[PDB]
Amino acid sequence: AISELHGPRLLLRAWRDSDREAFAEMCADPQVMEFFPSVLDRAQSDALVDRVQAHFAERGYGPWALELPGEAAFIGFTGLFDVTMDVHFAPTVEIGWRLAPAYWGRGLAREAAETALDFAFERLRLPEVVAFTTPPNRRSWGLMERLGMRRDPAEDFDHPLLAADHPMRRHILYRVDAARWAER
Ligand SMILES: CC(C)(COP(=O)(O)OP(=O)(O)OC[C@H]1O[C@@H](n2cnc3c(N)ncnc32)[C@H](O)[C@@H]1OP(=O)(O)O)[C@@H](O)C(=O)NCCC(=O)NCCS
Incomplete structure (x- = not known):
């Protein structure tokens, strides 16, 4: 009973068992995981999907x-999330994204994000959605600003779930509120 969402090219849907192999491939890809502390093995990948499924159920x-x-x-x-x-x-509420590298440079994360934020503001009627990343991850914060x-x-911050001296602790914060989203 999870609502699927449609964009011109994309279908945003509930996860299924068959997704775990392909997602695990992505999570083991150093180019995908460049701005995270490490690549994930299959157990860790599967544990992330478990958290995703739990979030949908809740x-x-x-x-x-x-x-x-x-x-x-x-x-x-x-x-x-x-x-x-x-x-x-x-x-x-935050928005995030991870795409397999074959699909970068096509406006697909942009489209997926627009579709998710339309849900956020039109359906959920949230006041705001944030996103955060590290300064080196230009592809990610670039998308955040292109979305508006x-x-x-x-408002830069140290990630509280990383060590106080973790090399990648420092994060930057983007925000979009309902009014700004509507004014695009
Ligand atoms: C972050 C990530 C989702 C961005 O994906 P992306 O493909 O660069 O983003 P977009 O969907 O905005 O596509 C933008 C690119 O497509 C191009 N483009 C082509 N057709 C387009 C269209 N119809 N609409 C928009 N842009 C289009 C733009 O010129 C741009 O190219 P550029 O990077 O050479 O300047 C992706 O790089 C990724 O998964 N990274 C690894 C995971 C990660 O770090 N996630 C963030 C953790 S905070």
Whole structure:
């Protein structure tokens, strides 16, 4: 009973068993995982999918699996996750994305994000959605600003689920509220 969402090219859907092999491939790809602490093995990949499925069961939304009808069953994920950790901007909802590298440079993460944010603001009627990443991950924060999200550098933060001296602790914060989304 999870609502599927449609874009011109994409289907945002609940995950299925068959997705885990392809997602595991992505999670083991160093180019996909470049700006994370490490690649994931199959157990870790599967544990992430378990958390995704749990979020969908609890909330009715989550990071949707991305299908490309006419092309491919699974190309990654894009969608919403509730922010509950001890950060200055909690509680809120974040958007995130991960695409297999063959699908980069096609506006597919852009389209998936637009579709997820339309859900956020039209259906859920959320006040705001945030996103966060590390400064080196230009492809990621680039997409955040192209969507119309905006960053205040004064809101940079250390990730509370990483060590206080973790090399990748420092994150940047983008925000988009309902009014700004509507004004695009
Ligand atoms: C972050 C990520 C999803 C971005 O994907 P992406 O394909 O670069 O993003 P978009 O969908 O916005 O596509 C943008 C590119 O497509 C091009 N483009 C082509 N057709 C397009 C269209 N119809 N609409 C928009 N852009 C289009 C743009 O010119 C741009 O190219 P460029 O990177 O050479 O400047 C992807 O790089 C990824 O999965 N990275 C690894 C995982 C990760 O780090 N996630 C973030 C953790 S915070």
